[PDB]
Amino acid sequence: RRGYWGNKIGKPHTVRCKVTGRCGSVLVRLIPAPRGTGIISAPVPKKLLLMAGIDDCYTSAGGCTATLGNFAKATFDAISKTYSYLTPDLWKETVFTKSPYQEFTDHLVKTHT
RNA sequence: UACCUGGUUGAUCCUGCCAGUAGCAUAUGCUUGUCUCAAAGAUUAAGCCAUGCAUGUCUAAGUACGCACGGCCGGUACAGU
């Protein structure tokens, strides 16, 4: 989930909110950034964030980032939390639409599992 | 540009320092066409010093008998310089 800096002009360029993600003494602090600053990070998370389409970000690390297996999994952990972070936009209540499992069950009553 | 990478082990995750990285100002090595700007015996010995120079000054208007120059003849405030 991508978001904006402090104002709108369409097409989100950065992270919605300031989030973290930890994997066994490594953590990352993805901080939002204004347009055109580029991704300011180490080489390892610069891969992931660039592929994500998050084109602007400030970061900072803490702990042993030498063992990169932790470092990248902790980045990926942070990138997950974006839709698991509650924002005032999402406060309006969902309509609880029926599941595809329910509606399309008619074709699956043959022998299908 | 709010950034990290290598090194303790058979292998893994930490703690931790060492090394790598960029700027700045002094010395030094090697090299060097053209253009502008210019810091420069402070670091150490506020150690010691040859020679040369670096503070003098007169307007119509303080004092002109320089045997100076000049004079158009002088002085009688008395010339001009």
Side-chain angles (χ1 to χ4, degrees):
Chain A
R1 182 181 175 184
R2 293 179 293 187
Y4 296 93
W5 188 49
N7 51 25
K8 306 298 185 297
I9 192 58
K11 299 291 178 293
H13 59 102
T14 188
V15 189
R16 183 59 184 93
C17 290
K18 180 172 64 183
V19 290
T20 186
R22 54 182 66 253
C23 184
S25 71
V26 189
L27 52 82
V28 185
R29 192 183 191 194
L30 305 177
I31 296 163
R35 298 179 179 272
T37 53
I39 305 174
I40 296 169
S41 304
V44 180
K46 190 176 293 182
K47 299 294 185 178
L48 299 174
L49 295 168
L50 187 58
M51 285 184 282
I54 299 171
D55 301 302
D56 296 297
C57 200
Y58 284 113
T59 59
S60 287
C64 186
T65 45
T67 50
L68 66 83
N70 296 103
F71 191 24
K73 288 192 288 186
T75 302
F76 190 65
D77 193 56
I79 292 171
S80 193
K81 296 189 190 297
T82 57
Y83 276 115
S84 301
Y85 193 91
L86 186 59
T87 50
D89 302 297
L90 273 52
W91 286 348
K92 63 95 177 182
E93 193 175 359
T94 188
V95 294
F96 300 119
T97 190
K98 296 185 174 64
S99 300
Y101 186 99
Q102 187 173 1
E103 302 303 293
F104 294 114
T105 196
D106 56 354
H107 184 230
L108 299 170
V109 183
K110 291 183 178 180
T111 188
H112 302 156
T113 191

